[PDB]
Amino acid sequence: SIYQGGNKLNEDDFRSHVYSLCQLDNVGVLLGAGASVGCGGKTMKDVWKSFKQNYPELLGALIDKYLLVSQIDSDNNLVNVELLIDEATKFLSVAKTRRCEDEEEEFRKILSSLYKEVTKAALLTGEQFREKNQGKKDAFKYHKELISKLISNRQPGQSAPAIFTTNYDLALEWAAEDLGIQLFNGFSGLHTRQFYPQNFDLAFRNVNAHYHAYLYKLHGSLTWYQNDSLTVNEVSASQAYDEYINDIINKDDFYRGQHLIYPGANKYSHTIGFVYGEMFRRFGEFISKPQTALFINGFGFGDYHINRIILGALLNPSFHVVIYYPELKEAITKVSKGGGSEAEKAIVTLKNMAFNQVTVVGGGSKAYFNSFVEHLPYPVLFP
Amino acid sequence: SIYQGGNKLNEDDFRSHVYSLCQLDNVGVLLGAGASVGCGGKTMKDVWKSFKQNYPELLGALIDKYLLVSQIDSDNNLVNVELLIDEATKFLSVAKTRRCEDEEEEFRKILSSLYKEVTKAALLTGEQFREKNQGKKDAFKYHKELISKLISNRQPGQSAPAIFTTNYDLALEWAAEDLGIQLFNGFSGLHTRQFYPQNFDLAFRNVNAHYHAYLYKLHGSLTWYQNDSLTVNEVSASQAYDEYINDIINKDDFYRGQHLIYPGANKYSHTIGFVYGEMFRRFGEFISKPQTALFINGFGFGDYHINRIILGALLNPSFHVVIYYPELKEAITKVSKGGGEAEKAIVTLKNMAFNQVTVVGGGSKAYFNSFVEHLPYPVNIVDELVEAIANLS
Amino acid sequence: SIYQGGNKLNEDDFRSHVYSLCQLDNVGVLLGAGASVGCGGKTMKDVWKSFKQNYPELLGALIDKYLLVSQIDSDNNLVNVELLIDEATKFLSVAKTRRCEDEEEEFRKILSSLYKEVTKAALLTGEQFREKNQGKKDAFKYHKELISKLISNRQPGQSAPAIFTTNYDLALEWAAEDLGIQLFNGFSGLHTRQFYPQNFDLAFRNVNAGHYHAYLYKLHGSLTWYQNDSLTVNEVSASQAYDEYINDIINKDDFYRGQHLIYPGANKYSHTIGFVYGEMFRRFGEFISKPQTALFINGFGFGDYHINRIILGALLNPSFHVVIYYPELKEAITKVSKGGGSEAEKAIVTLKNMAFNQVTVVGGGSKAYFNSFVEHLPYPVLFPRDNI
Ligand SMILES: NC(=O)c1ccc[n+]([C@@H]2O[C@@H](COP(=O)([O-])OP(=O)(O)OC[C@H]3O[C@@H](n4cnc5c(N)ncnc54)[C@H](O)[C@H]3O)[C@H](O)[C@H]2O)c1
Ligand SMILES: NC(=O)c1ccc[n+]([C@@H]2O[C@@H](COP(=O)([O-])OP(=O)(O)OC[C@H]3O[C@@H](n4cnc5c(N)ncnc54)[C@H](O)[C@H]3O)[C@H](O)[C@H]2O)c1
């Protein structure tokens, strides 16, 4: 079931492995959109099904008139969402430059509707999204426990654990609100929100002689809507519910990148998204140290950029990965018949690297999120 | 040779200021595209206009049926023809999806014609192209002297030199390599030289108790290509002249599809925007180090996205700019006539009391030789080889 | 049949040996075509068999006219060609000096049609030899494992191992391509690779908060060398190679005059022009002259006079080691005791018989193959399983 160079390893020793590794200077975790699922979020499949069910006419027109995809893919549920958005953007630019009014009218709906649905799927609660007592909710036991656990495996003189989320929902300040923790992200002041690099150099300390982590918003923000005038601002999850999200979701007007969000492969057809560059440069600088550690969970395999940086400097004897993939046996079986898509071949390459710096563990029920939470032990004063 | 209000100024002060600024731990130089115009260089605009004039039969379809450009815009040289072809790169897929065969043929014919037109005049080596390191020719001998100025100005225990090239050809790079120094162009290797972002933040030293330089190509490459390797492969020129450049040189009408990686195309494909984004990131954020002096020359500020990026990159408070305008008198006369956006903006910038901006309007003093001479300097090798070789019968 | 002073040793002793030798200041390895038979390639035996029964004129002349060989040796297939190559060089020298004409032509033909076959036995793949991403085949997994193990075992304060190749192909560089490994073999360059004596002290560093390499010392030159009048070796890929300098096999015949640089011949002074070769030997001598340094030999065919003489003179280093994995150990000793022996087999027999415990000869047979050698080297273990 588990193959590591033809040998066998036990999780009992891996417990001590994690416990000792976390004591190393660098500590972090590289998650994805899988975490949102644990809190009740909607996966890509659900969003695609909703879009295809709520707009049958567009699907039929695409199937018949132009045949960008075949009905076989739809029958087998092998439809990708990002490719559709990128195709829509390129066709929209073609229309805008060719001045085809009807194509512009029929394509200024696909983009606007797609982004409206993306935003609607971003929220994890619905009408409760405007309700307060956000920390007090009982569905965030995951984040509430995990933030403290990451910060509470330390003794004075160590670093700040880093949590990686790649979802629109502002779901990380909520557990922080519950526990009073401050997941810093380089912003100061409530009434006004702005970015400053120096703000990243603040850490709590006992004066008469704290628990917090740090934030990398790789997947943009839900309310940093750039007005194309050199501005960035944030509006609380209950205040933006009426100001501009309501206007752009109910006024049925022309759609642009009103609030910056990138769910499609086409990234820099609009070149004013600077969170991309800053966050990715910081991510690149992170692995530049020895005695390094990191973990992965709740993340798929479709990220060209991050998954190039991953193996970029896995040629260090201190950077590691503890990567799980429940659908690894199926991927291997599919590849054995000739090969798969980008994801299958990428995971095969990741698993087949001849190093011991990496290891893969599976088994199905044994690799659940609750199991990942339970693996972390309680710190011991006298080991 | 800087004028401000009609009073003469000495070049010694500017030379001393430049020398003082060059001592910073973060310094670099840039070479303009027009500097090579005097050494047989060519611009894509000239070939584009020559081809469009020679074949006006297709012109009607290019604008009326596609509207990527307007006749006024095409004639005014206010277009990004590279972006025109890049947009054709997706028009091809649009037609294929729509089964628009006639437009597909039109796009393919124009792409191949423009490719061959640009290629045939860019060989500059005849049938001996595949010979490696053909920079030994005396045509660029003078340029070598310039490089000699970058060796005696580097003191021990100082930041290593940085090299930035603007052209997309290796004519200057072949010479630079022939001088006998190790330069990295973002890749490492001999047979299959690939892209690796780690090398952007790594240096070299001696493990036991030293000089490294970085070559930054600002126009991609004529060598960078993609043989379905899912990566970027770079090699020497010979196998390039045998693999895919041959047909681009010889075949009149021959294209295959979205396989190669140049010259800033296929961005919508995931496989080519990644490296370009990495290079843009490093270019824009390399000035993040303290004690940095940056010089930008030859940029028209005519691109919306690049203009916005430059405006946002004002974070560095130690930026200096020098602008050479060979037609300053013409701009002044035009302003005197109540006419002329770019000309008015540059005139307004030149007509303000800001000492950190340098303007040169000598006209005939802006030549390449004058610029080389302005740089500071300290203050028959092969002749006998031919005789010795000839003596031995 | 295992005998070491009438006693035996357990696996723990060998494991401690491997751990200590790897953890010493320096590590050693030497690679030859010995066990390169199980990868689907070809051996020189088939090449010689084809050569004898495909060129009747020269074989008949040698048997009858030249008398430079013996029929019995050819029948037994135990003859050597390297001595014949040296004899060809000497014959060409004398014939050129004396101003003979026909013999000049015949010996030029012999030399060129022998160089052709010398280069012809370094493909192992066929037509697909000319492509990129060459490190994507089943024949390099063991090479990848060995290189990763040899490059990983250098904790802080420990340098990269030195590797010796002694064949024609570049399988190891091709295993290097696939893992971001650049096995610095004495040449660093893209357009022109020139020998810089100071290139041995260059490596990557984590300047602002990949350190993999070795020293693949080449003492046979390289198949990928083409010698120009400029006294420099610009270097090419496998496909560029197949294109521009080894297409003479089919189109043309016997027009090769000192382009690529590889010599099976025993003599090292007919090819005296090179002086960097003495620098390679000097690097070997620097290797021999340090304590806690070990050399491992797998693939050496007992065919040197300079390097092996340095081995004898250097084995007197209190820590230099010399070990060979050669299954035919009992047979050679028995044959020597029976009055046989080869040109150099007596030398290895003596080195086994040398009274130095610094050198120990260990066999086993099936466990002494290149696969076992690759599997032997373990990875560094800092965080993983420990003791106490
Ligand atoms: N604005 C910015 O600052 C910025 C910068 C860079 C990137 N981004 C965005 O960041 C990237 C975030 O990644 P993403 O949104 O494209 O997708 P993703 O990688 O976050 O998720 C892909 C999906 O795979 C699913 N999945 C999990 N396990 C799976 C399995 N075993 N098999 C199959 N599927 C599985 C998950 O439900 C889901 O994560 C976006 O690509 C990109 O738009 C934004
Ligand atoms: N790493 C790299 O290889 C790299 C780096 C930077 C740019 N590029 C190139 O840039 C990317 C896109 O091209 P681009 O639009 O940024 O550059 P560009 O030079 O093609 O366009 C810049 C703008 O300047 C305007 N302009 C005004 N006056 C001009 C003049 N006298 N001469 C030239 N232009 C004048 C043009 O209208 C417009 O092209 C492509 O990848 C590639 O073509 C590549």
Ligand SMILES: NC(=O)c1ccc[n+]([C@@H]2O[C@H](COP(=O)([O-])OP(=O)(O)OC[C@@H]3O[C@@H](n4cnc5c(N)ncnc54)[C@H](O)[C@@H]3O)[C@@H](O)[C@@H]2O)c1
């Ligand atoms: N003149 C020069 O400048 C120059 C250049 C390179 C090497 N050299 C040197 O040249 C000498 C020969 O080169 P090498 O050491 O690389 O050769 P090598 O390492 O390739 O020798 C191994 C080969 O396998 C053996 N072999 C193959 N088939 C056999 C068979 N059927 N039966 C028995 N034995 C068989 C042969 O002994 C042959 O030597 C070396 O001492 C040394 O490398 C000199």
